[PDB]
């Protein structure tokens, strides 16, 4: 699950770091890591607390 | 026109991508299994509603598809996609059109067995899927497991919902597709060796779960109600 | 970490130019009602040389950044063109509605590419009012992203069937526009032209500018294989690909073959090594000397 | 009326002035009964509540 | 406590989810429908912990 | 609108059709008699006598 929770949008527009970098500008591309942060520090929680 | 049974047959490869020994769940377009596939004689307004499996054991050499244009023949190949005008009996002798006044499209390419296709229109292509196997027992599509390997990809898109054949002056069986899931399983060579229709059986719902084949004793919460 | 050494891009060999001039700047555009599709494919693009110079009203790139237009590949651009009333070229966007928003051209609530319009009140602001450019205003209910309709019939509103009379709460369905060269900026006309592209279809072939460089392998390196850009160890293996095949995948979605487009050649992609690192030491009150452990 | 969590248990009818008690639609879990793969193909279903 | 969770803002407009809905368009009305699924996930979260 | 067919019943800003379920403040009432070819004056952003 742990693993399986890294294919997620979690509302950005798509879950790959390597590409949103390279298809937006600083200014507009930390507005959608940010949601992919939020997400994946989520997932860490859960497993850790189970 | 009698009417027989398939027996989990129509799967095709439904991405590019290369998998060896996972067990992987698609959701797309497939002919579910134990479908009720009409089984015509030797040639009717087919409809064709979102996907049409045609399979024939062999005369059977046209699909001329549109609304009231593309055309697929067997020269070889010819696929010229505009305006015809159609005949009454279109076989090939050979009247098929009358002109070609606005055309578009026109790809000429280079000019016992089982036959099966599957044609699709998804946002703008025309895929074609095929896989010719050999066979010894006469109509009556067998038991077993042909994973159908794309063949082109048309980017014609434009509308079409009639279809029919082109009889070469004989069997041909009908069935539609519909939105299923299915849980293709890989062997380690990357063919597709067996396949589950998601939705047919409550075991069948209960594999698709656990994602395996086999299913030992207990009980398994599926789905909700 | 294992830091990269260098880095290696690969291109498709591909002479053609793609055809942009014939659709910008031709003789005569479409009305707003009924807009044609240029599909674009298989050439080498340049979005830069659009970019800069000439004279462009708006441009406007949605889900993409405009200047980084020319490294990364794509999937049968399209292209739409039509001539739109001079307050509604910022009413072609997602989400935001309006007449000929919902009317005429919808676009996705989720579309990329770019808006690009420019000024046309010298060719298209005729004397007497071209009055050939039309747009829709009744419709029985709003358009699907990327619809198109050209079919008149008579409207009907509440009751007094219409049923071709165009009387009494009977309309015609659309309307023309009129356009004197002495029109104010709200209706002068303008021209648009919306670019618009998909990235995950299929690996096609349409791709900015960018000379390729020499395969390296069983070094960790940088590599940019048709857009898809990542840090590996490329090796030669034998899996069997079959012959549309092109990635590879494994038991947790991550990519670990690839094939190269020139040379059409199977490779492995393997993480550089990682670990972490734990010191060994007996106090600092005894000795200062440690002892470092790479872990993996 | 609500109560004693806030969720709506009845109702007035606004134009006969009537008294209406609400209930919820019913819903649960679907579970398979199955004796193995590898004994048998034949299952039953269970419906939770 | 639960079910009581159900009829606060989480800093949208409303809590009803139909309010919402039926009030805004849908591009903007997504902001809020997304606040309140991630209080109401941080909701279900604790009482499994717990 | 089913009515002795009003020439004119063509409203600003809304669709007639919409105008019931909206709901508006406090509207006022304006009667009085023109002639025919003055019809066409009453619109707003227009001019003349
Ligand atoms: C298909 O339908 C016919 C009647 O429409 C029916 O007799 C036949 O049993 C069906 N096929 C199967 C496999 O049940
Ligand atoms: C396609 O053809 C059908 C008639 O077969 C027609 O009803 C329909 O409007 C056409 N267009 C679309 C987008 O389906
Ligand atoms: C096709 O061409 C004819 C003349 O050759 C023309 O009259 C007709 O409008 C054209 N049709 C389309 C759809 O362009
Ligand atoms: C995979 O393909 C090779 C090629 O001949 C074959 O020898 C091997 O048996 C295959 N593996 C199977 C069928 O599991
Ligand atoms: C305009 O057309 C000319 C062709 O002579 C060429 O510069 C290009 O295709 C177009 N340029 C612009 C800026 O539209
Ligand atoms: C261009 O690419 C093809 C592969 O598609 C390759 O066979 C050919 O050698 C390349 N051209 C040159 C000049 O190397
Ligand atoms: C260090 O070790 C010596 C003897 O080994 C002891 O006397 C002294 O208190 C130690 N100091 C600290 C800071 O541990
Ligand atoms: C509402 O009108 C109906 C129609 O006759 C009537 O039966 C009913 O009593 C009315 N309700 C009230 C509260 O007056
Ligand atoms: C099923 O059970 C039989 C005997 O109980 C055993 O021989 C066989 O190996 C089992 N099948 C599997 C897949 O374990
Ligand atoms: C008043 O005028 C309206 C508009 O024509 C009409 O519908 C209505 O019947 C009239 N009322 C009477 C009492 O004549």
Redesign the interface.
């Known amino acids: 699950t742990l693993?399986?929770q890294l294919?997620s949008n979690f509302?950005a527009?798509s879950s790959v770091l390597?590409?949103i970098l390279?298809?937006?500008?600083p200014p507009?591309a930390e507005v959608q890591i940010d949601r992919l942060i939020t997400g994946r520090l989520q997932s860490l929680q859960?497993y850790v607390?189970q | 026109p009698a009417y027989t049974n398939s027996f989990t047959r129509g799967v095709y490869y439904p991405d590019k991508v290369f998998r060896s020994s996972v067990l992987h769940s698609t959701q797309d377009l497939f002919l579910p299994f134990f479908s009720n596939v009409t089984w015509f004689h030797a040639n009717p307004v087919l409809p064709f509603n979102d996907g049409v499996y045609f399979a024939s054991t062999e005369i059977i050499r046209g699909w001329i598809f549109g609304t009231t244009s593309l055309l697929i023949v067997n020269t070889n190949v010819v696929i010229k996609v505009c305006e015809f005008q159609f005949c009454n009996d279109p076989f090939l002798g050979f009247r098929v059109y009358s002109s070609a006044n606005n055309c578009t499209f026109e790809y000429v390419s280079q000019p016992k067995n089982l036959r099966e296709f599957v044609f699709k229109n998804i946002d703008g292509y025309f895929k074609i899927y095929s896989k010719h196997t050999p066979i010894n027992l006469v109509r009556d599509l067998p038991q077993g497991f042909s994973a159908l390997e794309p063949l082109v990809d048309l980017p014609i898109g434009i509308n079409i919902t009639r279809f029919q054949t082109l009889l070469a002056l004989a069997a041909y069986y009908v069935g539609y597709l519909q939105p299923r899931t299915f849980l293709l399983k890989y062997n380690e060579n990357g063919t597709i060796t067996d396949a589950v229709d998601c939705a047919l059986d409550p075991l069948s719902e209960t594999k698709c779960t656990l994602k395996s084949f086999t299913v030992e004793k207990g009980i398994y919460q599926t789905s909700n109600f | 970490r294992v830091q990269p050494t260098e880095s290696i891009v690969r291109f498709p060999n591909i002479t053609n130019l793609c055809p942009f001039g014939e659709v910008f700047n031709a003789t005569r555009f479409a009305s707003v009602y009924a807009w044609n599709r240029k599909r674009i494919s298989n050439c080498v693009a340049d979005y830069s040389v659009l970019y800069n110079s000439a004279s462009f009203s708006t441009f406007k790139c949605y889900g993409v950044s405009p200047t980084k237009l020319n490294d990364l590949c794509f999937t049968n651009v399209y292209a739409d063109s039509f001539v739109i009333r001079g307050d509604e070229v910022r009413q072609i966007a997602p989400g935001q509605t309006g007449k000929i928003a919902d009317y005429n051209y919808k676009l996705p609530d989720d579309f990329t590419g770019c808006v690009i319009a420019w000024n046309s009140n010298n060719l298209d602001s005729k004397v007497g009012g071209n009055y050939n450019y039309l747009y829709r205003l009744f419709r029985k209910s709003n358009l699907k992203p990327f619809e198109r309709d050209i079919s008149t019939e008579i409207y009907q509103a509440g009751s007094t069937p219409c049923n071709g009379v165009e009387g009494f709460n009977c309309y015609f369905p659309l309307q023309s526009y009129g356009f004197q060269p002495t029109y104010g900026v709200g209706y002068q006309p303008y021209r648009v032209v919306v670019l618009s592209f998909e990235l995950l279809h299929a690996p096609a072939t349409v791709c900015g500018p960018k000379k390729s460089t020499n395969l390296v392998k069983n070094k960790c390196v940088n590599f940019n294989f048709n857009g898809l850009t990542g840090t590996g160890v490329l090796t030669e293996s034998n899996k069997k690909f079959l012959p549309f095949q092109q990635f590879g995948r494994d038991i947790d979605d991550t990519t670990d073959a690839v094939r190269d487009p020139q040379t059409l050649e199977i490779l492995d992609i393997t993480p550089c090594s990682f670990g972490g690192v734990s010191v060994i030491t007996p106090g600092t009150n005894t000795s200062n000397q440690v002892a470092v452990l790479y872990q993996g």
């Open positions: 693993v399986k294919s509302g527009i390597n590409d390279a298809r937006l500008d507009e859960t607390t």
